[PDB]
């Protein structure tokens, strides 16, 4: 018999306990049954996103049959799953494979209980654009005989059948709904014993609850049935792995940890032992960025809320960093990526200044279908999609055309930035930092180091006169950087000199420096210029120290361990001399 070669007896497998018990979906199973109980064209098809559970419904059909929950009409029935192999076992000798298929149909109608045939991946029924499709299920469907049940996704359905036409007439579409978190948890509980058996572990009820809710928060591209199960099963596996690696229970923290391993979201690592680093994040950031403590605190707070789980699930952190050039707005953001990932290059830098009106959105989201280039995603889908815990940086947001900022409004609230092709990114787990110079006209008021009142308000004025209120309203915090005072400059000099040593890839580029008060003072006085923030220090060091070093190196006046000497200016010591 062809069914013994080309199909799986779902009802046998149900009888044998090989299929998961179905949880919930009572209306969908009833709907399926009502359609199968029809006299004419009794052919339902389960439609819905992949990861929904529509196969589970089919398993449910088999279970209902085994236990006769099925109406009298359908109780005397069997359910088989037709493999593609009936046709895909080879078409050598044109028509043979169609004959095998018809053969199957003959067996199905012929007497032996109400055999219903399940068609997985129904898109395959499309054949070669009709043509080779022949009569796939033609007279069958036209007579209410040879009843079939199938399943496929919206994405597939949208083409396949809608393109075919005939199949729409023949099949009855039924949508399968994605379960709520409540329902999702119920599913997990129903499958709990399967998993406990699968891995030899107990599952904490709280853990089951956690996976369902957690999955909704951190696995946006995969529907809840799957996502929750992925977290539960992977957690259970983790315990089993640990058992072999050399506790046989999954708890909520097992899940959170593993979810972080799969999602990249550090929040769920529950790294309680590392809270000290997070708590002192302020301190650590201050070791690079001098002063600007309010900005530093603003960041630390955003990060801490995220790590605690308190940060609102739909609200990306959002900041506007305002100040004169050289104030560390960019530097702080980079340092934050440094802290968070131990890698400043983790950051998704967006040159948002390069965003004139007509292009900006295609650089960030990419274009829709049709237009040249489909690497949709430009910068943001292509990066946010893979690094949801990342930090976005929009340098000089004031220059971005308001049109793109309009797009940023989605990003900045609910994270619903969508691709050019209509896919939702869901980047609410990220941190968004934007910078600008709008307040320069008031920071240049020179009203103190810590920016004084009035100056801050005038800056706010400039911001309000530049960005639309709706934009500003979506900003978690607007931060104005402080003027870099002499004391800040002294601290900065210490830091910049250290960086110079960090840039020294080889030990022929090395300072002892000396003049830790003299040079420090020299540099501090010369770089103490409001008009450039900390930046001229970079120029001072280069012009007074490094340019000269370069020459000393070329002249072999240095081997290692360099010294800076005071000139009434600065210069370098000659250690060897043209050696």
Q: Which of positions 486-505 make contact with a copy of itself (CB under 8 A)?
A: 503-505
Q: Does 515 bind a copy of itself (CB under 8 A)?
A: no
Structure tokens at 405: 């900022």
**5 vs 468 by CB, closer to a copy of itself:** 468
CB contact burial 372-402 (16+ within 10 A = b; e otherwise): eeeebbbbbbbbbeebbbbbbbbbbbbebbe
Minimum Å gap between C-beta 139 and a copy of itself is 27
Q: Which residues pair with 106 in a beta bridge?
A: none
The count of chain residues that interact with a copy of itself, using the rule CB under 8 A, is 94
Closest to 171 (Cα-Cα) out of 143, 145, 146, 141: 141
- Give the pairing type, strands 570-572 and 562-566: antiparallel
Structure tokens at 295: 């900005």
Helices (DSSP H) in 309-373: which residue ranges?
Answer: 329-341, 360-364
328 labelled binding-site residue? yes
Q: Interacting stretch for a copy of itself, rule CB under 8 A, among 91-99, 101-109, 173-181, 254-262?
A: 254-262
Q: Which of 139, 144, 309, 373 binds a copy of itself (CB under 8 A)?
A: 309
**196 vs 494 by CB, closer to a copy of itself:** 196
Minimum Å gap between C-beta 496 and ligand AGS is 6
Taking the CA atoms of 63, 66, 67 and 73 in sequence, report the sign of the dihedral they define. positive
Q: Which of 98, 107, 164, 233 binds a copy of itself (CB under 8 A)?
A: 233
CA quadruple 515, 516, 519, 521: dihedral, nearest 10? -130
**Spatial distance between the Cα atoms of 104 and 383, rounded to a whole number of angstroms:** 49
Q: Interacting stretch for a copy of itself, rule CB under 8 A, among 57-65, 115-123, 138-146, 543-551?
A: 543-551
Minimum Å gap between C-beta 204 and ligand AGS is 20
Q: Which residues pair with 152 in a beta bridge?
A: 47
Which partner from the list ligand AGS, a copy of itself, none does 567 bind, CB cut-off 5 to 8 Å by kind?
A: none
Minimum Å gap between C-beta 304 and a copy of itself is 4
H/E element, 480: strand 477-480
Q: Does 134 bind a copy of itself (CB under 8 A)?
A: no
533 labelled binding-site residue? no
**Spatial distance between the Cα atoms of 481 and 455, rounded to a whole number of angstroms:** 11
Helices (DSSP H) in 369-506: which residue ranges?
Answer: 380-384, 402-411, 440-443, 455-464, 469-472, 486-502
Letters for 338-377 (x = contact with a copy of itself by CB under 8 A, - = none) are: -------------------------------x--------
499 labelled binding-site residue? no
Backbone angles phi and psi of 462, in degrees to 5: -55, -40
Where does this chain bind ligand AGS (CB under 6 A)? 20, 22-25, 40, 50-56, 153, 187, 191, 225-226, 229, 289-292, 325-331, 395, 435, 484, 492, 495-496, 533-535, 538
Q: Enumerate residues 136-175 that contact a copy of itself by CB under 8 A.
A: 162
**73 vs 495 by CB, closer to ligand AGS:** 495
Q: Which residues pair with 397 in a beta bridge?
A: none
Q: Does 237 bind a copy of itself (CB under 8 A)?
A: yes
Cβ–Cβ < 8 Å for 432, 392: yes
Q: Does 58 bind a copy of itself (CB under 8 A)?
A: no
Structure tokens at 28: 């969908």
**88 vs 312 by CB, closer to a copy of itself:** 312
Q: Which of 535, 565, 571, 575 binds a copy of itself (CB under 8 A)?
A: 535
CB contact burial 569-579 (16+ within 10 A = b; e otherwise): ebebeeeeeee
Residue whose structure tokens are 């005071």? 566
Q: Does 426 bind a copy of itself (CB under 8 A)?
A: no
Which partner from the list a copy of itself, ligand AGS, none does 30 bind, CB cut-off 5 to 8 Å by kind?
A: a copy of itself
Residue whose structure tokens are 């044998």? 16
Closest to 570 (Cα-Cα) out of 533, 528, 524: 524
Which partner from the list ligand AGS, a copy of itself, none does 173 bind, CB cut-off 5 to 8 Å by kind?
A: none
Minimum Å gap between C-beta 237 and a copy of itself is 4
**Spatial distance between the Cα atoms of 423 and 60, rounded to a whole number of angstroms:** 31
**Spatial distance between the Cα atoms of 425 and 418, rounded to a whole number of angstroms:** 6
Backbone angles phi and psi of 489, in degrees to 5: -60, -40
Q: Strand, helix or coil at 564? A: strand
**Spatial distance between the Cα atoms of 312 and 429, rounded to a whole number of angstroms:** 9
329 labelled binding-site residue? yes
**109 vs 257 by CB, closer to a copy of itself:** 257
81 labelled binding-site residue? no
Q: Does 40 bind a copy of itself (CB under 8 A)?
A: yes
Q: Enumerate residues 79-108 that contact a copy of itself by CB under 8 A.
A: none
111 labelled binding-site residue? no
Q: Does 510 bind a copy of itself (CB under 8 A)?
A: no
324 labelled binding-site residue? yes
Cβ–Cβ < 8 Å for 6, 83: yes
Structure tokens at 157: 């359905």
Q: Does 553 bind a copy of itself (CB under 8 A)?
A: yes
Which partner from the list a copy of itself, ligand AGS, none does 504 bind, CB cut-off 5 to 8 Å by kind?
A: a copy of itself
**229 vs 425 by CB, closer to ligand AGS:** 229
326 labelled binding-site residue? yes
From first CA to last CA, the distance across the chain in angstroms is: 93
Minimum Å gap between C-beta 221 and ligand AGS is 13
54 labelled binding-site residue? yes
Residue whose structure tokens are 């018990």? 21
Binding residues for ATP: 48-55, 323-330
Binding residues: 48-55, 323-330
């Amino acid at each position: 018999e062809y069914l013994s070669k080309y199909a799986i007896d779902m009802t046998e497998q149900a009888r044998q306990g090989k299929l998961d018990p179905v949880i919930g979906r009572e209306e969908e199973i009833r709907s399926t049954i009502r359609v199968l109980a029809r006299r004419i064209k009794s052919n339902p098809c389960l439609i819905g996103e992949p990861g929904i559970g529509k196969t589970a419904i089919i398993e449910g059909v088999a279970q209902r049959i085994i236990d006769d929950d099925v109406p009298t009409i359908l109780q005397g029935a069997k359910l088989f799953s037709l493999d593609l192999a009936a046709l895909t076992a080879g078409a050598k000798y044109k028509g043979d494979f169609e004959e095998r298929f018809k053969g199957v149909l003959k067996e199905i109608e012929e007497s032996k209980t109400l055999i219903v045939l399940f068609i997985d991946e129904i898109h395959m029924l499309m054949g070669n654009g009709k043509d080779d499709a022949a009569n796939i299920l033609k007279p069958a469907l036209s007579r209410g005989q040879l009843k079939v049940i199938g399943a496929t996704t919206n994405n597939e359905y949208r083409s396949i059948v809608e393109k075919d036409g005939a199949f729409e007439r023949r099949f009855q579409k039924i949508e399968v709904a994605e379960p709520s978190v409540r329902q999702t948890v119920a599913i997990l509980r129903g499958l709990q014993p399967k998993y406990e058996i699968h891995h030899g572990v107990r599952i904490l009820d709280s853990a089951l609850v956690t996976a369902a809710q957690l999955a909704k928060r951190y696995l946006p591209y995969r529907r809840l049935p799957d996502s929750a199960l992925d977290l539960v099963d992977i957690s259970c596996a983790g315990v089993a792995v640990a058992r072999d690696s050399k506790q046989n229970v999954v708890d909520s923290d097992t899940i959170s940890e593993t979810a972080a391993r799969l999602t990249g979201i550090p929040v769920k690592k529950l790294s309680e032992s590392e809270n000290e680093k997070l708590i002192h994040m302020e301190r650590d950031l201050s070791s690079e960025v001098v002063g600007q403590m309010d900005a530093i605190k603003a960041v630390s707070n955003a990060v801490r809320l995220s790590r605690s789980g308190l940060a609102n699930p739909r609200q990306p952190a959002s900041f506007l960093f305002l100040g004169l050039s050289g104030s560390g707005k960019t530097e702080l953001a980079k340092k934050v990526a440094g802290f968070l990932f131990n890698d400043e290059d983790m950051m998704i830098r967006v040159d948002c200044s390069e965003l004139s009106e007509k292009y900006a959105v295609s650089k960030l989201l990419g274009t829709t279908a049709g237009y040249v280039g489909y690497d949709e995603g430009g910068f943001l889908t292509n990066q946010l999609q893979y690094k949801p815990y990342s930090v976005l940086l929009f340098d000089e947001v004031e220059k971005a055309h308001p049109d793109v900022l309009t797009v940023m409004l989605q990003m900045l609230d609910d994270g619903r930035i969508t691709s050019g092709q209509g896919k939702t990114i869901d980047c609410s787990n990220c941190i968004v930092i934007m910078t600008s110079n709008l307040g320069a006209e008031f920071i240049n008021s020179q009203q103190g180091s810590k920016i004084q009142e009035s100056t801050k308000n005038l800056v706010m004025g400039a911001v309000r006169q530049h960005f639309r209120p709706e934009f500003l309203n979506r900003i978690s915090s607007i931060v104005i950087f402080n003027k870099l005072s002499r004391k800040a400059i002294h601290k900065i000099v210490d830091i910049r000199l250290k960086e110079i040593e960090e840039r020294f890839e080889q030990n022929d580029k090395h300072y002892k420096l000396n003049l830790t008060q003299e040079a420090k003072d020299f540099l501090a006085k010369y770089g103490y210029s409001d008009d450039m923030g900390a930046r001229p220090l970079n120029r001072l060091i280069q012009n007074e120290i490094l340019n000269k070093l370069a020459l000393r190196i070329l002249k072999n006046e240095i081997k290692d361990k360099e010294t800076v000497n005071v000139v009434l200016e600065e210069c370098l010591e000659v250690l060897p001399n043209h050696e």
